[PDB]
User: Which sequence fits this backbone?
DNA sequence: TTAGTGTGACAATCTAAAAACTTGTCACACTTC
DNA sequence: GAAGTGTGACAAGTTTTTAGATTGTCACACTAA
């Protein structure tokens, strides 16, 4: 689907938090990171907001968003087009100011994030590079109730689909330790969602996976 | 002139260097590379290139170009201003070509970056990570000669402030085991020059150093 | 006498070179009914 | 038996360690005036 998204998750929390600002503001080119605005948008001293901001920016070094391409390629070689998050970025303890020049090519997709930052609470998600974990995660969320909890049954053949999984995983045992186990155990170690699941079989062949999640923020136990 | 992006190139891998040239030629600040036309140049297989191309192009991203500010900082914190080599990079095997768009912020700097393969023959430089070594190298080379060799006598104090050598380096013992020896060596083995040094000490204190270089290539 | 000259030493950095994981995909051996 | 199920193995890739070098700095024992 949208790589720019699959990139966001790929970021450090404090980073994706940063990104919110930039998108909250998009509600051009060069922008300065307002500690004060950040500090209170996440309940925090400027002392701390500062620190975070600083690391995030630094960590944002050498990054980039990859938009894959079909036509442009041929053979056992896929074609792309890649862009760094920031054309320019810099800090100055002296004037206590953090500057960042957002790469233009990318700006146009930000507006897309807010729908994310809000529905899927991205701003509080550790680094996630499993394009399938992500996909599953947005699906499950989709079924949340204002209780930050839920149960939803998905059909395997439906999963393997809207999550474009590799053929080999059609062989259930693999599906297990490659997708299911991995992802569920990745939603619990990165996102604020807790995930439990049960295999619901119709005979010997297991047909559906029934997940039950809840909002770890509103939980009081393991 | 000189600067970061300049002594920043010296690091670049053969491969990158090899690419930084096909770029410099052209440089609004875009570049295209056709694995074939390339691969013919370097006597590599059509695909042996692609591997070499993307490999370095990758090392290009990631290692962003940064300008450290010594005045702008405060506390343990150093001040900076960083810029990734490219704005937009790409490869479309369907058309066996690799495109690239130099960061506009770095475009300007190219003017003298071109002055580097030119006057300082960078395109023949092995990889170098020691600035001091590359400084002392850009100096001597200024005083070339028909044959390209030459002898220069520089003031120790001068070869310090002009190269921003660290304070602990005013002391002659260290100076030799961390700047001279080192940097001289990392030139005799990474550039087309055979650096020879002779220090002139007026009794107890040494003041000038006699660098006698010579162009080994031709 | 004395300013001046090789080393070791140590904290602090980079860096190359490894062990250590991922992702897809299978072929084994076993149970089940 | 026709199907389903966990583990090993693996080529390819990626990442996190590990162990080495590099730098900036100094107290030290140490030779020619």
Assistant:
């Amino acid at each position: 689907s949208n790589d720019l998204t699959e990139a966001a998750y790929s970021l450090s929390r404090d980073q994706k938090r940063m990104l919110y600002l930039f998108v909250d503001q998009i509600r051009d080119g060069i922008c300065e990171i307002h500690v004060a605005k950040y500090a209170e948008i996440f309940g925090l001293t400027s002392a701390e907001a500062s620190k975070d901001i600083r690391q995030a920016l630094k960590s944002f070094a050498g990054k980039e968003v990859v938009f894959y391409r079909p036509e442009e390629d041929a053979g056992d070689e896929k074609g792309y087009e890649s862009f760094p998050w920031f054309i320019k970025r810099a800090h100055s303890p002296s004037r206590g100011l953090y500057s960042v020049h957002i790469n233009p090519y990318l700006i146009p997709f930000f507006i897309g994030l807010q729908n994310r930052f809000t529905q899927f609470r991205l701003s509080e998600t550790k680094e996630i590079t499993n394009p399938y974990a992500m996909r599953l995660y947005e699906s499950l969320c989709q079924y949340r109730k204002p209780d930050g909890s839920g149960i939803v049954s998905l059909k395997i053949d439906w999963i393997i689909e809207r999550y474009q999984l590799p053929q080999s995983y059609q062989r259930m045992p693999d599906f297990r330790r490659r997708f299911l186990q991995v992802c569920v155990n990745e939603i619990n170690s990165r996102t604020p969602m807790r995930l439990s699941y049960i295999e619901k079989k119709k005979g010997r062949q297991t047909t559906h996976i029934v997940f039950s999640f809840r909002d770890i923020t509103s939980m009081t136990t393991g």
Summary: Residues 129-130, 166-169, 171, 174, 178, 182, 203-204 of chain B lie near DNA strand D (CB under 10 Å from a C1').
